[PDB]
Ligand SMILES: CC(=O)N[C@@H]1[C@@H](O[C@@H]2O[C@H](C(=O)O)[C@@H](O[C@@H]3O[C@H](CO)[C@H](OS(=O)(=O)O)[C@H](O[C@@H]4OC(C(=O)O)=C[C@H](O)[C@H]4O)[C@H]3NC(C)=O)[C@H](O)[C@H]2O)[C@@H](OS(=O)(=O)O)[C@@H](CO)O[C@H]1O
């Protein structure tokens with residue numbers, strides 16, 4: 001491939017990142033995209049350093065601070081983008097062009113050149129600048145000289161001599177993985193178009209192949225659909241999206257060319273659209289539990305990341321077979337149509353606007369999110385859906401860290417892995433509307449928590465420490481899931497708790513047992529901590545209302561249920577006191593992120609909790625949540641033994657769903673919960689239909705070679721579906737012995753016949 005092939009590739013990249021070939025004349029959404037492009041460009045030009053002998057390019061960005069060096073270059077690439085976009089205010093403006101070129105020249109002289117040693121964050125030198133400088137070279141190819149290309153290519157190659165590796169020489173270079181491998185290869189591929197270097201381009205394309213190979217440990221995509229980055233943090237929602245965005249752009253750029261991605265194993269990446277990304281997308285937002293430290297970012301939210309995932313999926317769909325293309329488009333049309341809270345076209349780029357308009361022009365109908373359970377045992381995450389709600393559980397374990405903090409971000413997030421219950425609903429802004437600026441980080445919804453104050457960055461940055469717990473895991477059969485977590489508290493308090501969740505098509509039953517701590521402080525379990533925005537949403541009870549006055553906590557009477565206007569119902573399944581607090585909380589994003597604005601946000605919350613007191617001995621809880629339930633339905637939850645607690649202690653936790661005729665259990669020790677037994681740790685769901693017993697089983701430690709169940713509902717003599725060996729115990733009960741060697745927490749489905 002020669003000069004013409006390289007020119008064609010550069011032109012395609014410019015088409016992709018500007019949308020210049022696809023602007024629809026007089027379209028109001030295109031006009032808004034150009035306006036947003038114009039305002040950003042105008043803002044940057046206003047900040048140009050015009051001083052003779054300047055030592056920065058922008059008066060508000062120091063080249064001695066590596067993050068401000070990156071922003072220098074992204075502003076320059078944004079300006080080049082505007083200069084190349086028909087109808088933009090600066091389109092083809094020679095004075096603006098001259099200022100971009102002078103900015104690239106001086107940033108190179110002053111700072112980013114092939115003699116400079118890295119200082120500060122490696123990512124700035126190897127990913128932040130190269131992607132932006134490469135884009136600027138390609139955008140400005142007709143305008144930069146050969147000597148300018150030589151200088152800038154040399155700078156990039158100095159920092160990134162091989163995109164299969166990362167870190168400066170003084171650190172020891174390691175294999176780049178996952179999102180980092182995609183980003184380093186993107187910067188080198190685009191730089192290879194500017195410099196017409198087929199050898200670097202081929203090597204960078206070949207480097208993409210690693211990122212979609214299945215892994216069983218470390219970083220990458222697991223066969224169950226989990227995606228981990230930084231070894232111990234569930235990360236589909238932020239690093240997974242960086243990977244998805246970069247591969248969508250690169251696949252589209254190279255398709256049909258001499259450099260096309262041709263590795264057939266990229267099918268694993270395509271399978272991940274539904275296998276990994278779709279289940280953790282909720283009405284257009286990536287779930288908070290899979291986006292790690294980005295929850296602390298005011299302007300990199302679940303909806304910003306979901307909108308990037310939608311753009312990428314739409315871009316990939318163009319190359320797919322017809323049925324897959326239509327399925328992915330349907331998924332996207334649904335995540336777009338249902339999101340009235342941060343509509344995807346508000347502040348969308350011109351390319352994103354074009355993909356959204358192209359989708360609308362297909363007339364492909366919106367696909368609803370399927371009810372039911374999606375389990376990700378490799379990353380200790382589960383998703384559950386019913387009409388009007390999605391529950392995301394956030395666990396941690398000897399495989400998965402309590403939280404990631406780093407770079408001044410999410411240093412307060414140390415309870416976010418303590419069994420959080422995120423109930424996403426039609427309140428689309430629940431977790432987005434300054435929730436992470438104002439929420440009580442010691443009373444996040446669903447957690448059990450030792451009230452000992454912990455320092456920011458407790459347990460270390462980058463997910464370096466994990467709880468040395470017994471297990472966390474899950475299984476599901478049909479409409480019912482069983483999820484368990486042995487919580488070990490962060491900050492060496494000695495907090496221990498056995499938390500389980502049994503989740504039907506409508507209600508979530510939350511059991512807790514064996515709670516104690518060594519710190520001497522009170523321990524709490526949070527039934528909910530729910531953002532009311534500026535609302536005064538009524539908490540209704542059997543007697544009337546509760547917590548009508550902000551700041552004064554009240555104890556629920558003996559009706560045992562409370563209904564929150566705009567949400568649904570909560571009910572206690574034991575006689576423990578439920579404390580209910582209406583509160584107003586304030587905070588700034590600067591309080592949770594070094595880059596956050598100083599603006600103070602104020603939000604109203606409803607906070608419902610159980611107090612286990614000081615020095616609990618085998619403390620416990622039992623309650624349920626019924627998202628979307630009316631007051632009438634909430635008042636009835638505890639009638640008729642619909643949610644029948646079987647056992648809730650240090651051996652096992654189990655509940656029967658009367659209407660679903662289905663029982664769910666978690667086992668901590670060998671023993672029986674009702675008429676089901678297990679020989680060791682297990683998650684089980686079972687249901688009898690006449691003369692047939694259906695079971696789902698997982699071995700949640702991921703380390704046991706076998707597991708034996710003592711079967712409920714009488715004796716069983718044949719296996720109809722699945723694997724396992726039937727047997728009989730000393731007491732005449734049927735047993736099922738499973739080989740669980742290497743199952744990695746996955747579920748086995750079995751059907752038996754009497
Ligand atoms: C300083 C150091 O040595 N730390 C490493 C740690 O490296 C840190 O982690 C990541 C990484 O690439 O591995 C890198 O995260 C990315 O940081 C930039 C800014 O630096 C962006 O964050 S933001 O500016 O606050 O938004 C970036 O965000 C994402 O940006 C983009 C995009 O640029 O296209 C898309 C998304 O919308 C957005 O979420 C952020 N990525 C994400 C997904 O958050 C840090 O800069 C880097 O310092 C790890 O290094 S690793 O290579 O081994 O993985 C860590 C692992 O244990 O080791 C530490 O020592």
Ligand code: NA
Pocket residue numbers: 229230231232233401462463464
């Ligand atoms: Na980590």
